Amino acid sequence: FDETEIEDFKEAFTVIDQNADGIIDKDDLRETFAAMGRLNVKNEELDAMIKEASGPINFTVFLTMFGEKLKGADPEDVIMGAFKVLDPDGKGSIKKSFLEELLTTGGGRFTPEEIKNMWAAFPPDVAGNVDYKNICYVITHGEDA
Amino acid sequence: FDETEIEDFKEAFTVIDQNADGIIDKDDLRETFAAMGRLNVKNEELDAMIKEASGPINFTVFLTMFGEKLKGADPEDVIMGAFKVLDPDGKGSIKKSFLEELLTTGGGRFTPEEIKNMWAAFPPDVAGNVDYKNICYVITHGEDA
Amino acid sequence: KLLGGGDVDHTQYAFGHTKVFFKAGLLGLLEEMRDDKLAEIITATQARCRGFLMRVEYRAMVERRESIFCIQYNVRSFMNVKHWPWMKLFFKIKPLLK
Amino acid sequence: SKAAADDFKEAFLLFDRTGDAKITASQVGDIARALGQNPTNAEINKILGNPSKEEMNAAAITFEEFLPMLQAAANNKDQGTFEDFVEGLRVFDKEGNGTVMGAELRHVLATLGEKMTEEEVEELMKGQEDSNGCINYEAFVKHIMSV
Amino acid sequence: SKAAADDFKEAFLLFDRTGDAKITASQVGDIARALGQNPTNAEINKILGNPSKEEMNAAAITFEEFLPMLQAAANNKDQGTFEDFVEGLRVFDKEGNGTVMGAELRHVLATLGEKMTEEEVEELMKGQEDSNGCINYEAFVKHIMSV
């Protein structure tokens, strides 16, 4: 965890903790979702978020919960560092079959089935290994941009 | 030491001395590191910083310790002064082989092996002697920007 | 340029303005001996290369060691997270920030 | 002999991916090179077949066969003379300066004799050949013999 | 003599790149020039060989040989007469004004007698020759004798 990433989680903690007392309760979760447009947010969704913690969601409980789910989270500059080492001549997005072979043949984390799941929402270019950069974006901030 | 550089070290001394009494103790070092995100900062790192001084870290002991480690520290404007004299026509980053030849053939501080270490984290452009300016940045403030 | 390759007697022939000159069956014999002599010379020079070739692969494999992991773990996160309320939230919200 | 070098057995535990203390016959070529031996691939191939050992079917190994094969390859290290390596490339390009044109060395290392992949050829020229397209083989063969 | 000039020993510590207080025989020509002596390179060469000293094989030095070689070169400073330097270049170009055409002095300084590199020739004309292509050697030889 770099310090600017921890400051981003402190700003997200303050936007969900609308009572500003330092502990995100279930009313803060529901009022942050209602301010984003969720008028139908069920109480069972709020209870499932609170069921991931053993205590009240203060800043260090929110940081330890996000730490334990993001144990391989990598910032965009280090993902582009590794992709610039995979394309060491610069500019070009690397081939689809080169990333499939190098993921498998180096590591068990790069096994195929997982490579079909990589191509599956990370579209073609991304999946193929040709573009580059959009995948670093969606690994640090999810969903389609 | 120019006076604005000494005022920058006075501001860094005040941010690490969170008790504001004028002497940075080991608790100030640990609480400044914890406020930057270091939750695992060992006591042996704090003891190795205090082992570089013969007494308590007040402002003049911190200035003399930084003076004795930065006996060739050069501000960015004087490094760009010297690089504008090496590229006297302006704008262009100077060639890789020209900086290797002129470092060696003028001085013993410009010997090759050291030139391989210059290229080694100061990347290509920087190492090569083509770009310019990013090396002045990282000599006044380290690490990748 | 072609004759560059082959474990052939580079003697037995000779070039000139319109054509190459070649021996047989003696010169033919010569070459042959020669041929064997390069397998030696060659075979040995190949090896080191081969050797050496992979020796650089290890230096790369090794470098790579971590950059993968980084990549490895890093992805996994996301696959888990991207479905988490809190994380989607941070997501829609991440922009309003400065 | 031990000089009993027990670090050859510790390096066999770094190349065996299953942890059972056996190394397949296809890895023995590259691990002899990683222990400080450069047998040519035809030599590694011959020896194998010589001993009615087929590298075409599944293989396992034991340390008790890999140790004497490394000791049979260790006598052939007297073939590694650097005079002949630099004189080979000195006969490969004209003029009195040691420079191969880029693509001459890349196509010769991939297609002449024991085929080296073009991926490995690019990894062996990376850094020693600059953008002039001229590989200085005095420093190139020096750095190739540094590993 | 000391006048014991101990700054010659302090300048030997600025030219020895290893710090062991020895200066190789190939540096002795340029360091005699940096101490205020202009022996010609053939003279530096002769003296060396004269003393069965080979500048072809590795060399080291000691201060105890470099001091008397600088004192043997110091008698030859009576050959540095500026009348003959300005009259040499005055016979090298027509008319009553001291100007050499650019390329005449550059090709003569690189190819006639003791070969000066064209890099050093450009560094000695830089500033004294303007864009008219005419080197005024009255001020040019004045500035060359200012160092």
Please spell the DSSP secondary structure of A77-130, one letter per residue.
HHHHHHHHHHSTTSSPPPPHHHHHHHHHTT-STT-HHHHHHHHTTSTHHHHHTS
Residue D98 neighbours by CB distance under 10 Å = 18
Q: Using an 8 Å Cβ cutoff, are E85 and E47 in contact?
A: no
Q: Which of B99, B110, B144, B141 is nearest to B5 (CA)?
A: B141
Q: Which residue has the tokens 């004299």?
A: B85
- C-alpha–C-alpha distance, residues D135 and D140, integer Å: 7
Q: Using an 8 Å Cβ cutoff, are D110 and D116 in contact?
A: yes
User: Is A1 within 8 Å of B37 when comparing Cβ atoms?
Assistant: yes
Q: Using an 8 Å Cβ cutoff, are B113 and B101 in contact?
A: no
Type of residue at B87: D
Q: Please, which contacts does C53-57 make with residues 24 or more away whose CB atoms are closer than 8 Å?
A: C53/D109, C53/D116, C53/D117, C53/D120, C53/D121, C53/D124, C54/D30, C54/D33, C54/D120, C55/D33, C55/D34, C55/D147, C56/D120, C56/D123, C56/D124, C56/D147, C57/D120, C57/D123
Q: Using an 8 Å Cβ cutoff, are D114 and D40 in contact?
A: yes
Nearest-5° angle of CA E42, CA E46, CA E48? 120
- C-alpha–C-alpha distance, residues D62 and D44, integer Å: 17
Residue A28: C-alpha distances to residues A121, A132, D75 (Å): 32, 38, 76
User: In B42-62, which positions are buried (b, 16+ CB within 10 angstroms) versus exposed (e)?
Assistant: eeeebeeeeeeeeeebebebb
C61 contacts: CB under 8 Å, gap ≥ 6: A106
Torsion of CA D89, D90, D95, D100, to 10 degrees: 20
**Contact status of A2 with chain B (Cβ, < 8 Å):** yes
Residue E88: C-alpha distances to residues D23, E85, E93, E125, E141 (Å): 82, 5, 10, 17, 11
Any idea how long chain C is? 98
Helix, strand, or coil (residue B117): helix
Mutation target among C1, C8, C41, C46 for the D interface, most CBs of D within 10 A = C46
Per the entry, the structure determination technique was cryo-EM
Q: Using an 8 Å Cβ cutoff, are D120 and C53 in contact?
A: yes
DSSP state of B17: -
Q: Using an 8 Å Cβ cutoff, are B37 and A3 in contact?
A: yes
Per DSSP, which regions of chain E are E strands? 99-101, 134-136
Helix, strand, or coil (residue B60): helix
Structure tokens at D49: 């077949």
Chains A and C touch (3+ CB pairs under 8 A): yes
- C-alpha–C-alpha distance, residues E99 and E90, integer Å: 8
Any idea how long chain E is? 147
Nearest-5° angle of CA B132, CA B135, CA B138? 150
Q: Using an 8 Å Cβ cutoff, are B107 and B72 in contact?
A: no
Type of residue at D50: N
- Residue D28 backbone dihedrals phi, psi, to 5 degrees: -70, -30
Helix, strand, or coil (residue E27): coil
**Contact status of A141 with chain C (Cβ, < 8 Å):** yes
- C-alpha–C-alpha distance, residues E134 and B77, integer Å: 38
Q: Which residue has the tokens 């070039």?
A: C15
Mutation target among C58, C63, C93 for the A interface, most CBs of A within 10 A = C93
Residues from chain C that touch D108, judged by Cβ atoms under 8 A, are 4
